Design a protein around this ligand. Structure first.
Ligand SMILES: CC(=O)N[C@H]1[C@@H](O[C@H](C)[C@H](N)C(=O)O)O[C@H](CO[C@]2(C(=O)O)C[C@H](O)[C@@H](NC(C)=O)[C@H]([C@H](O)[C@H](O)CO)O2)[C@H](O)[C@@H]1O
Lengths: 116, 211, 212
């Protein structure tokens, strides 16, 4: 079990960014996205539950971001649109070890830099 | 088209029975194909165990026929696996599959007489000779069962981190280490703490690795 | 009954090369199937040469009797996985899998950075002494680790662990743990780890004396 996030970079205000994270089986577990400013704490961004259990988003990223998941590729995705300077942070991916979605976030990723 | 999902206990005592259930969605098990149980040992070796057909006939691996049973429940569209008098050699990840073209996610079953135990965490202090790149880590020794998670600096240190797969010692417990390579210029200014988390024992250890 | 022998065990390939995996059977085989696994095993080639869902055209299957093959015309980085040949027999009913061929992505040769770690005082208070030898970021994976205490080669008292091929730099990391009791550990002085790898002109030894 290991996670590796990808897809970040540098981008101007208003443009997009598609993040991805592969797992080293996650079809039964939820994959959440978290971000952290250099001088702040990790805040929740989005969470893709199991296929059919829909998705959930924070208040900061409602309408602008879209979370997805490919069970066949054991990967999660996070499409980001209309990026603001406030969204600039390091983005992490975690697995909710509890199948009941209580959020036992045990496994975490290396992270990816995002700067606007 | 067809979806499959295994479910069952992940820990079994030796000389006792292991039972698993495969839930099928999108296709009736009475329509066709063989419905097999296939496991994979830690050595990544695959072994087909048994099968039940659409008409209910059974086919078993001769190496397991004295202690295997494959039943089904067509009302719930499920088929089950029962392995009797299991040994530690039966520790593997079990899959259910339809005729070999659709597989489940896989359930990890461990057979052991070991009881739940929290791990001892020891610092792997950086040596006296460090140019350059220094190496430090933590030793997570003697625990049961799998798995255990390790972070560094509450997740603030991910680059250069390597947490090795656990090894089953002769005592029946698991042991691993998590190492991280850092600049030698940071050993005097930057603090390094490893965070070990083992859920079955509800233990959380934070050990500072000092030069 | 029927034994499948897959050759080679590990296959290192760069993007753009032709890869051929062989699966030999002890007795004649009507049809050989192939499975990919990175994750549940996915059906990749069935009925010797039919391509399953999601398989690029660069893959190809062939063979008959006692020898079957899987061919990749131009290998890609996404093709790095384990490939198992599978066979089904009727008269003695048995579904046999091969041991699998590991196709890995090839990168440049990197020698391991070796490190030695003496047992901590906290571990010695429990009567056990663990000496850890760390081999970091090396490729290819083939290596050798020897434990020599007081210039005496050790055997049967070390356990090795290797990580999977890294997702970023495609390297390996290895740890070798030597386990002793504090009584046996305190009866010697020189503890050394001798590392052998194809990127090293000579073996690299990391030693330490007990009380230093
Ligand atoms: C559409 C398709 O891909 N069909 C393949 C499938 O055949 C099914 C049963 C077909 N729809 C049908 O005839 O109804 O699988 C066959 C392979 O058949 C056998 C084989 O002889 O190798 C049948 C045998 O009974 C199976 N045994 C068990 C225990 O399941 C095996 C086995 O499933 C495979 O070897 C994989 O483990 O398959 C063929 O590939 C069709 O193309």
């Amino acid at each position: 079990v290991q996670l590796x996030x990808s897809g970040g970079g540098x981008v101007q205000x208003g443009x997009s960014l598609x993040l991805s994270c592969x797992a080293x089986x996650x079809x039964x577990x939820x994959x959440x996205w978290x971000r952290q400013x250099p001088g702040x704490x990790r805040e929740x961004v989005x969470x893709x539950x199991x296929x059919x259990x829909x998705x959930x988003x924070x208040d900061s990223x409602x309408g602008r971001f879209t979370x997805s998941x490919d069970x066949x590729x054991x990967x999660x995705x996070l499409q980001x649109x209309x990026l603001x300077x406030x969204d600039x942070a390091x983005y992490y991916c975690x697995x909710x070890x509890x199948x009941x979605x209580x959020x036992x976030x045990x496994x975490w990723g290396x992270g990816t830099x995002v700067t606007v | 088209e067809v979806q499959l999902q295994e479910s069952g206990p992940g820990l079994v005592k030796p000389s006792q029975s292991l039972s698993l259930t495969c839930s099928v969605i999108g296709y009736s098990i009475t329509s066709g194909y063989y419905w097999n149980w296939i496991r994979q040992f830690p050595g990544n070796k695959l072994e087909w165990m048994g099968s039940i057909n659409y008409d209910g006939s059974n086919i078993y691996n001769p190496s397991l026929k004295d202690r295997i049973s494959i039943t089904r429940d067509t009302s719930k569209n499920q088929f089950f696996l029962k392995l009797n008098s299991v040994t530690t050699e039966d520790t593997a990840t079990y899959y259910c599959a339809r005729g070999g073209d659709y597989w489940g996610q896989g359930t990890s079953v461990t057979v052991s007489s070991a009881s739940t135990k929290g791990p001892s965490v020891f610092p792997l202090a950086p040596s006296s000779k460090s140019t350059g790149t220094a190496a430090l880590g933590c030793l997570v020794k003697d625990y049961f069962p799998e798995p255990v998670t390790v972070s560094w600096n509450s997740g603030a240190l991910t680059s250069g981190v390597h947490t090795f797969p656990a090894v089953l010692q002769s005592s029946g417990l698991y042991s691993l280490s998590s190492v991280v390579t850092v600049p030698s210029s940071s050993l005097g200014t930057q603090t390094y703490i490893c965070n070990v988390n083992h859920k079955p024992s509800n233990t959380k250890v934070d050990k500072r690795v000092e030069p | 009954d029927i034994v499948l022998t897959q050759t080679p065990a590990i296959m290192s390939a760069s993007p753009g090369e032709k890869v051929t995996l062989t699966c030999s059977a002890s007795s004649s085989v009507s049809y050989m199937h192939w499975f990919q696994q990175k994750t549940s095993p996915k059906r990749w080639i069935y009925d010797t040469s039919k391509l399953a869902s999601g398989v690029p055209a660069r893959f190809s299957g062939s063979g008959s009797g006692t020898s079957y093959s899987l061919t990749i015309s131009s290998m890609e980085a996404e093709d790095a996985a384990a490939y198992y040949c599978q066979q089904w027999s009727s008269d003695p009913p048995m579904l046999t899998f091969g041991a699998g061929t590991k196709l890995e992505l090839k990168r440049t040769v990197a020698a391991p950075s070796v490190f030695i770690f003496p047992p901590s005082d906290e571990q010695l208070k429990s009567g056990t002494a663990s000496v850890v030898c760390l081999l970091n970021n090396f490729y290819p994976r083939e290596a050798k680790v020897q434990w020599k205490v007081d210039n005496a080669l050790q055997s049967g008292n070390s356990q090795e662990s290797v990580t999977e091929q890294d997702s970023k730099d495609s390297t390996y990391s290895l740890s070798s743990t030597l386990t002793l009791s504090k009584a046996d550990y305190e009866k010697h002085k020189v503890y050394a780890c001798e590392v052998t790898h194809q990127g090293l002109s000579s073996p690299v030894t990391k030693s330490f004396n007990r009380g230093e």
